[PDB]
Amino acid sequence: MIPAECTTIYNRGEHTSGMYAIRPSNSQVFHVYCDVISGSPWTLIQHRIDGSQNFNETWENYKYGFGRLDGEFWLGLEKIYSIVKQSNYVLRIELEDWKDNKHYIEYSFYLGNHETNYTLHLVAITGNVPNAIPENKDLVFSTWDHKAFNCPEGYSGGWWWHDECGENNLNGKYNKRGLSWKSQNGRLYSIKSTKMLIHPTD
Amino acid sequence: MIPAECTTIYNRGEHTSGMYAIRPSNSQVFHVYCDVISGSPWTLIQHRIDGSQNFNETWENYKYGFGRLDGEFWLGLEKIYSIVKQSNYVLRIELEDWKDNKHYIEYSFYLGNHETNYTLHLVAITGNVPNAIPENKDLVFSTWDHKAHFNCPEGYSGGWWWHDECGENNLNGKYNRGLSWKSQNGRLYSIKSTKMLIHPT
Amino acid sequence: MIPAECTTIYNRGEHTSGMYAIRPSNSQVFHVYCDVISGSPWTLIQHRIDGSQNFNETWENYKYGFGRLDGEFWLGLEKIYSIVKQSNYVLRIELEDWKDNKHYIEYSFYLGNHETNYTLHLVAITGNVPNAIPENKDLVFSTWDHKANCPEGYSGGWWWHDECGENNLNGKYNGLSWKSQNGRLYSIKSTKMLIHPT
């Protein structure tokens, strides 16, 4: 009776973005920000705006969530996995630079449970910004107090990593200039604000 | 049990503005922004701040809503009708110009169902700025993909209620300076932010 | 089932700050802002950002609350009492200056009902700033339209004693003044008042 996630909230007639209660299978009720983009609903799992929220958090906090749902936040790996579980989901990354240009990229992904350290497997689909995250590789999540070779760009924040590493840490240190997104070719994008958004494939 | 509208929320002791769940009679639960103005509760049905949200939406999305309840949004004609068909409602239009002067006007009104293309019938009650919307006339809603009648120049873009008289009154129009409000006998008002608000009479 | 306060919300696994419904015993449902500070949940009862909200409100609005839960607001004395009742709670005051620094101070307190004019009785516990509010004294609430006086209290609703002093966080914004008597005057840009159980 309580919707499982944002797509079913949308299909039940809530077509506006905002904060909603959901309850995925085998889970407690918790609140999410549902973000409708061009008529399609997403669950917002990460949001960064100005660096005010410290993202160099513990493993426990990256697992259960931190921040403010009306501002900068991280939903929580346990909550994200409760949504995704064994399903193929779609991940959208939205970056805005300091010149206020908007870039997006979408991936098809699978996510493992806490026993796999929430291993992420991505394949890029579309976007107007080149990919910076290794594709078709098992990416292991790590925090400052919970290391999985340690990537130089993982020194701050919780992120998914492989030996190839890279400048791709959207949960990295917000320098007070923003964040960095270095694609495979070499072009590095200065990032002022980020969103990470998911929705089921079907 | 679940409050019917923002006035119900306020009367049950919740006097802060914010996003709340409501369930109008024989309707599904949905969320609204309750806006209390000078100690008086209102249900906010549209809000425009800086023109970041595109308002040149489909008929389908004007029926069911679009946008961000904590920002720029349109509640949706089906949901507006679900609220108002319960009783009789006052419509408050609030306009902010670029000098940050607040202007307002309040109307008595009734609203038809989808079978009438949500026809609006307005009577101006009070305000501090001239009314620009034809009164005591069936105003038919139209969008870019859903035309009822004659195409008004201020209605090329957006979902709005129109009559043969047209006029510069389309608060869901293209946001440039900003939006335009002008009565037939009055001067043009350049509008930076808008609100549309309803509560029972 | 509706949780009774922000501690239950957090313990149930919602560790993000924000607006949530709650329902203390013998009370209607109402919404609060749960603020998570260093992994500990607090109920935000007062919040001021930039003076956009007018805090020279009437007694009835100070009892039932006013403002925006995601912005500047006052939760309301009746709702604050619904949470605390005759329990001994903990109060935290958060003061942010204009130079971006943050100052805090924590109190043990108990609270009286409306026929008491919501008397506040507190004593400081910790804090990186001196206290400007009289400790271990019964401070009674008053608004511009409801007296029980201090010149710092001509604007806003606040708890007062004969000591007075610039400690009115609900006072007139320009920003706000926090000064212990014969001490440094802090000009405050933003304020937070938070409570949680012991």
Numbering used by the authors:
A (entry chain A): 241 to 388, 392 to 419, 430 to 455
B (entry chain B): 241 to 388, 391 to 418, 430 to 454
C (entry chain C): 241 to 388, 393 to 418, 431 to 454
Task: Provide the publication's sentences verbatim.
These proteins, human angiopoietin-like protein 3 (Angptl3; also known as Ang5) and angiopoietin-like protein 4 (Angptl4) are, as the names suggest, related structurally to angiopoietins which are involved in angiogenesis via their interaction with the Tie2 (tyrosine kinase with immunoglobulin and endothelial growth factor homology domain-2) receptor. Here we determined the structures of the fibrinogen-like domains of Angptl3 and Angptl4, structures which offer new insights into reported loss of function mutations, the mechanisms of action of the proteins and open up the possibility of rational design of low molecular weight inhibitors. The fibrinogen-like domains of Angptl3 and Angptl4 form compact structures and, according to fibrinogen nomenclature, can be divided to 3 subdomains A, B and P.
β7 and β8 form a small antiparallel β-hairpin, which is braced together with α5 and stabilized by a disulfide bond between Cys394 and Cys408. Angptl3 can be superimposed on its closest structural homologues, identified by Dali server, Angiopoietins 1 and 2 with a rms deviation of 2.3 Å (192 equivalent Cα positions; 4JYO40) or 2.4 Å (192 equivalent Cα positions; 1Z3S41) respectively. For example, the P subdomain of Angptl3 contains only 1 α-helical segment and 3 β-strands and does not superimpose well with structural homologs. In contrast, no distinct electrostatic properties were identified on the surface of the P subdomain of Angptl3.
